[PDB]
Amino acid sequence: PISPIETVPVKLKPGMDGPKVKQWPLTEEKIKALVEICTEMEKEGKISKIGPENPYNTPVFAIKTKWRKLVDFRELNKRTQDFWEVQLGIPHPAGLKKKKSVTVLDVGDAYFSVPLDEDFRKYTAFTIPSINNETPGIRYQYNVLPQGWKGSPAIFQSSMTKILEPFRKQNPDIVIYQYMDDLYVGSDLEIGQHRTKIEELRQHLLRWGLTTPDKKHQKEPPFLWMGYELHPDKWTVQPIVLPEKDSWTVNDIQKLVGKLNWASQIYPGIKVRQLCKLLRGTKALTEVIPLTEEAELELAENREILKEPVHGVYYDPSKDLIAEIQKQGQGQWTYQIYQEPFKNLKTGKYARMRGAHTNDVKQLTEAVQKITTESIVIWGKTPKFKLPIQKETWETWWTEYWQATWIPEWEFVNTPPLVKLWYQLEKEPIVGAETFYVDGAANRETKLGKAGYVTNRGRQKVVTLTDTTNQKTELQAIYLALQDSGLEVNIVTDSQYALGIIQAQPDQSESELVNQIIEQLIKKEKVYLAWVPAHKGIGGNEQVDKLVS
Amino acid sequence: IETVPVKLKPGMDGPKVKQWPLTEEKIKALVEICTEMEKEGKISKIGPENPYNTPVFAIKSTKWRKLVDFRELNKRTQDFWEVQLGIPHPAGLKKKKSVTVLDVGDAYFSVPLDEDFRKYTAFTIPSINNETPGIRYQYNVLPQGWKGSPAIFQSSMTKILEPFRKQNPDIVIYQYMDDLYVGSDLEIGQHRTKIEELRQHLLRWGLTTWMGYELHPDKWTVQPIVLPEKDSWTVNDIQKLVGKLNWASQIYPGIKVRQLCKLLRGTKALTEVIPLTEEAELELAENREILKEPVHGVYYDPSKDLIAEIQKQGQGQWTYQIYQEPFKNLKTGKYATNDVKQLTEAVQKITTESIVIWGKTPKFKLPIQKETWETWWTEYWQATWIPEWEFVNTPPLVKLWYQ
Numbered sequence: 001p002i003s004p005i006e007t008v009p010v011k012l013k014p015g016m017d018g019p020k021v022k023q024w025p026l027t028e029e030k031i032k033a034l035v036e037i038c039t040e041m042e043k044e045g046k047i048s049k050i051g052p053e054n055p056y057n058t059p060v061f062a063i064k065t066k067w068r069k070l071v072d073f074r075e076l077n078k079r080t081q082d083f084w085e086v087q088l089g090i091p092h093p094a095g096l097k098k099k100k101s102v103t104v105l106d107v108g109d110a111y112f113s114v115p116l117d118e119d120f121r122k123y124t125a126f127t128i129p130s131i132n133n134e135t136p137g138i139r140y141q142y143n144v145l146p147q148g149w150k151g152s153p154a155i156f157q158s159s160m161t162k163i164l165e166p167f168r169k170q171n172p173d174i175v176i177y178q179y180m181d182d183l184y185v186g187s188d189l190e191i192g193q194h195r196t197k198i199e200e201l202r203q204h205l206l207r208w209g210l211t212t213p214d215k216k217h218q219k220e221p222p223f224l225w226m227g228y229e230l231h232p233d234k235w236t237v238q239p240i241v242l243p244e245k246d247s248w249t250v251n252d253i254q255k256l257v258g259k260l261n262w263a264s265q266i267y268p269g270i271k272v273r274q275l276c277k278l279l280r281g282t283k284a285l286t287e288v289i290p291l292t293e294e295a296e297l298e299l300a301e302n303r304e305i306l307k308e309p310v311h312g313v314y315y316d317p318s319k320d321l322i323a324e325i326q327k328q329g330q331g332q333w334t335y336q337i338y339q340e341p342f343k344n345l346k347t348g349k350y351a352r353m354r355g356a357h358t359n360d361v362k363q364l365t366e367a368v369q370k371i372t373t374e375s376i377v378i379w380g381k382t383p384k385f386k387l388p389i390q391k392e393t394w395e396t397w398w399t400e401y402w403q404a405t406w407i408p409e410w411e412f413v414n415t416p417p418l419v420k421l422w423y424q425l426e427k428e429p430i431v432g433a434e435t436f437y438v439d440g441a442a443n444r445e446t447k448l449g450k451a452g453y454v455t456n457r458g459r460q461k462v463v464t465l466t467d468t469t470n471q472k473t474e475l476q477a478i479y480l481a482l483q484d485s486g487l488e489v490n491i492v493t494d495s496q497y498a499l500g501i502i503q504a505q506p507d508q509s510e511s512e513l514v515n516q517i518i519e520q521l522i523k524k525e526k527v528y529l530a531w532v533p534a535h536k537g538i539g540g541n542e543q544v545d546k547l548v549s
Numbered sequence: 550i551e552t553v554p555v556k557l558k559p560g561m562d563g564p565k566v567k568q569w570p571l572t573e574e575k576i577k578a579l580v581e582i583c584t585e586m587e588k589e590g591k592i593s594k595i596g597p598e599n600p601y602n603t604p605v606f607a608i609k610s611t612k613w614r615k616l617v618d619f620r621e622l623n624k625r626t627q628d629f630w631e632v633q634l635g636i637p638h639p640a641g642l643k644k645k646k647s648v649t650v651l652d653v654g655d656a657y658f659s660v661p662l663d664e665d666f667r668k669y670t671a672f673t674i675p676s677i678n679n680e681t682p683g684i685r686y687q688y689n690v691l692p693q694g695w696k697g698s699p700a701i702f703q704s705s706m707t708k709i710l711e712p713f714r715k716q717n718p719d720i721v722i723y724q725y726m727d728d729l730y731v732g733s734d735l736e737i738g739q740h741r742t743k744i745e746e747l748r749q750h751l752l753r754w755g756l757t758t759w760m761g762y763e764l765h766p767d768k769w770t771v772q773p774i775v776l777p778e779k780d781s782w783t784v785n786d787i788q789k790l791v792g793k794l795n796w797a798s799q800i801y802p803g804i805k806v807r808q809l810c811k812l813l814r815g816t817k818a819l820t821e822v823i824p825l826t827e828e829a830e831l832e833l834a835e836n837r838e839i840l841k842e843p844v845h846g847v848y849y850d851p852s853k854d855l856i857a858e859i860q861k862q863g864q865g866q867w868t869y870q871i872y873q874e875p876f877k878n879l880k881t882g883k884y885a886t887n888d889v890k891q892l893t894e895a896v897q898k899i900t901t902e903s904i905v906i907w908g909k910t911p912k913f914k915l916p917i918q919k920e921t922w923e924t925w926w927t928e929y930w931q932a933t934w935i936p937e938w939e940f941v942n943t944p945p946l947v948k949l950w951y952q
């Protein structure tokens with residue numbers, strides 16, 4: 001059919017006119033097939049013949065043992081207006097409420113069963129060329145949504161929505177989800193009453209020109225949909241085979257990481273970090289990359305996790321969400337969401353370096369934030385969190401930190417590793433403690449660093465770095481003061497850069513130098529860090545500036 | 550009442566802003582609201598032929614309320630609401646003894662909106678877990694939150710206020726978006742009485758309308774840069790005091806440092822107490838005086854954008870600075886249960902003040918993660934507008950320089 005639904009009005013892009021694309025001379029087989037296909041369509045009202053007056057043209061092509069018409073809507077797609085996006089996101093199985101019965105109904109010839117805006121149809125004109133373009137080709141234009149046209153997905157979805165709107169209003173008891181050609185109808189009605197409700201839907205659809213599959217042709221659960229399996233009272237990702245290979249190409253590892261990322265949705269403790277590190281630099285797609293030992297260790301552990309299958313449960317809106325997070329290796333985090341203890345709705349992981357230097361407390365918050373956003377998307381509410389950090393540790397951190405950090409209801413859960421601050425810079429200068437005035441200076445052109453220091457106990461020192469920036473020298477300067485020093489120490493610098501880094505209590509960093517400084521900072525008992533303006537004539541800073549310059 | 554033609558300029562399109570995920574209670578609140586507004590004719594459902602979008606949120610009392618983020622549309626409609634139909638800002642408002650802020654956004658629902666402009670006002674109520682395509686609407690009347698709404702409505706506004714203004718010519722009313730700012734030198738009982746009378750004016754014409762009852766602009770002052778008055782001075786204390794003053798000299802004309810540097814002579818212990826010289830005490834008190842006064846040389850430029858920087862001082866304490874050219878402060882200040890809740894109150898306080906003082910809101914440099922703020926800001930937000938914001942790392946030195 002073609003839905004009675006009123007057409008959606010379509011414009012071109014304001015300062016543009018529809019396509020005048022030359023039709024290529026086609027082969028006889030193709031010229032023959034098109035005509036045959038066009039006649040069959042024409043008689044169903046999908047297309048209509050048109051006069052030579054209409055100046056618009058789009059290429060048509062034929063390709064195979066059925067023949068298929070392929071219309072090249074590229075020029076029209078450039079010239080047709082932008083539309084609203086189809087969906088803001090795709091649903092997650094974890095977010096689905098549990099229903100007694102659910103059925104899948106796919107619309108037959110979805111786009112072709114929906115009318116195009118009368119005023120726009122002229123722009124959809126195409127020409128079946130005569131054999132060796134001797135004579136005027138046969139000229140058609142679409143009355144319905146063309147295949148491969150920019151607006152077909154949106155207008156279809158939009159049309160379908162208006163068509164369901166009444167049925168939804170009449171039947172709030174029933175739940176429907178639209179996804180492309182498909183409809184998924186669910187209810188808590190006893191199986192007999194469902195079939196009827198489906199029947200009057202199928203009818204209601206046909207009343208509006210939308211054909212659906214007979215009860216005998218409807219698919220049965222599990223529903224293989226978008227890489228998931230949706231069973232009567234559980235869901236899971238579709239089966240994951242980790243290729244058993246002697247040599248791993250870049251391509252193989254990419255397909256593995258992708259597969260592991262997908263699996264991490266319901267399989268806990270999935271890790272990808274060491275597999276990702278292999279992909280760094282840029283190699284050939286086919287290039288064989290030798291697996292490091294830690295890569296080999298992750299792969300094995302992942303193979304253990306996948307050995308037995310795991311399922312996720314569906315969402316019950318009258319229970320609370322609970323999110324648990326565990327640390328597992330620096331940077332790497334894993335979470336589980338459930339409502340009833342350990343019947344997981346879903347799983348996941350977080351393992352990105354937001355910035356250059358960070359600590360476990362900062363990363364736990366970023367993880368929590370990421371999980372909070374995800375829950376709001378999926379369930380429209382935030383979970384109760386169960387976190388591997390002491391309230392007192394958190395209390396200490398957020399208050400002293402300059403950024404505004406906040407997180408919703410959470411409780412501590414003793415699931416080692418426990419998140420902790422691995423050092424605590426002092427609030428006051430340390431009496432009976434050496435005061436190191438550090439400084440650095442890299443000659444811009446030669447890049448010859450001269451990191452060094454001066455102390456109030458008399459000591460001086462200047463090493464020579466090579467090919468370093470001023471940032472490195474000022475930081476190497478600080479590493480020296482920590483190296484050549486007691487368990488207590490006071491360090492004066494004129495580098496806000498270094499101060500900023502270290503005042504954040506980082507326990508993790510990309511820079512080699514910074515991790516060296518962290519090592520020292522953990523080993524110390526008391527460290528106090530102060531800043532001064534450079535070149536302003538300060539007792540100590542000016543002295544270090546001398547031997548550094 | 551027929552519609553005023555509205556324009557975008559020739560070379561920029563409408564807003565295509567993503568809708569931020571909302572909690573279920575807000576989504577439910579939003580559909581009830583939007584059902585009423587469709588029945589009442591204020592908005593109409595739209596198809597996918599409208600490619601524009603503007604975010605919407607729910608806020609509060611226990612009354613839910615619809616907030617639409619028109620920051621992009623306002624940005625793209627700048628010529629219309631600022632040059633063509635601009636509302637001038639009265640410099641007197643800041644001088645007044647008390648200033649009450651009244652919500653007048655209901656006024657805009659009576660005036661219809663330019664038929665050819667309505668497409669640019671499209672918004673989406675999203676679905677939980679993306680179950681549905683989400684409910685798409687657009688405005689038929691003037692929308693609250695758009696800067697064109699008062700720009701168009703001001704002619705009707707003047708009529709409403711004309712009698713009150715005639716009868717009260719030492720009270721100053723100012724429209725900024727959905728709010729009227731009403732300032733008098735009257736005593737508070739009379740001020741409040743005069744507000745209640747203004748409500749009745751607006752109640753005819755159909756408008757039933759970080760901050761106390763009222764603001765008090767005349768009592769606003771610069772939070773001076775705190776130079777400590779210490780009994781005893783260590784080397785650290787001087788170093789702290791020098792950095793303070795060093796950076797203050799880049800803002801204030803004639804801040805001197807010389808004397809205190811000489812005290813930091815060679816390479817001393819930070820712990821070490823040090824005797825205070827005479828000229829050091831002189832310069833110190835002379836700097837103190839300078840910091841009490843406003844910055845000489847800095848003036849508001851209407852062409853340039855205002856910018857607000859905020860620092861967390863711990864213990865529910867927040868400092869802030871408004872300026873246009875970096876570190877040339879037109880105003881600085883302070884604000885006294887959780888981090889985001891406070892930050893959002895602070896932003897609202899600072900914005901209100903910015904409007905009263907300059908008739909513009911500042912682009913905020915917020916000390917927070919983009920996603921944390923975006924998840925939570927609506928939870929405690931009570932304003933009808935939304936200022937521009939970006940997300941920043943606080944340089945911990947500047948946090949210290951403002952107490």
Ligand SMILES: CN(C)c1c(Oc2cc(Cl)cc(C#N)c2)cc(CC(=O)N2CCc3ccccc3C2)[nH]c1=O
Nearest residue numbers: 096097098099100101102177184185186221223225232
């Ligand atoms: C109607 N609707 C949106 C809906 C479901 O339908 C869907 C939803 C989505 Cl995103 C994809 C598919 C496919 N392809 C089916 C499934 C469930 C999960 C569920 O309750 N199930 C899973 C399938 C099923 C099948 C038969 C009997 C019971 C159940 C119970 N819950 C629902 O509310």
